[PDB]
Amino acid sequence: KVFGRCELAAAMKRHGLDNYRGYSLGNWVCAAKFESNFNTQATNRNTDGSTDYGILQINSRWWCNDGRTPGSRNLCNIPCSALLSSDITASVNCAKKIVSDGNGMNAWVAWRNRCKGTDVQAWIRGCRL
Numbered sequence: 001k002v003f004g005r006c007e008l009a010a011a012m013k014r015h016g017l018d019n020y021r022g023y024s025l026g027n028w029v030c031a032a033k034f035e036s037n038f039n040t041q042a043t044n045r046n047t048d049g050s051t052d053y054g055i056l057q058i059n060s061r062w063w064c065n066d067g068r069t070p071g072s073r074n075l076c077n078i079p080c081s082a083l084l085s086s087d088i089t090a091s092v093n094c095a096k097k098i099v100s101d102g103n104g105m106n107a108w109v110a111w112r113n114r115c116k117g118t119d120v121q122a123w124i125r126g127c128r129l
Contacts, residue, residue, distance in 0.1 A: 001086035003038040006127030015092040021099050026120030034110035041084050054083035054091045
C-alpha cells in the first residue's frame with residue numbers, strides 16, 4: 001500500500017508515534033517519505049547482504065528474520081515480511097524498539113541526512129490529526 005501523507009500521519013499518531021522518545025510526528029512522516037516514498041512494500045538490499053523492509057526500511061541484520069541474513073539477530077521477533085503489510089502496526093512497534101536503542105532516529109540514514117534539523121512539522125501541515 002502507498003499511503004498518502006496525512007493518511008500516514010494519522011495512522012502513525014493513532015499508534016503512539018507522536019512525540020515518542022521526544023520525536024514529533026513530522027519526523028516520522030519525513031523519515032517514511034525518504035526511506036520508502038510511503039510504500040509499505042519497499043525493499044532494498046544492502047551490500048552486506050542484509051535487506052531493509054517496509055515503510056521505515058527496517059534492516060534484517062538486527063531487527064527481523066528473513067532467513068537469508070546469516071549471523072543476524074531478530075530483535076523485534078518478527079518475520080521481515082510482516083513489515084510489508086498494509087497495516088503498519090508491526091513496523092511501528094519495531095521502530096519504537098529501534099528508536100529506544102540509544103541513537104534515536106539517527107538509526108535511519110535518510111532521517112539524519114534529509115529530515116534532521118529541517119522544518120519537519122511541514123510534513124503534517126494541512127492534515128486533520
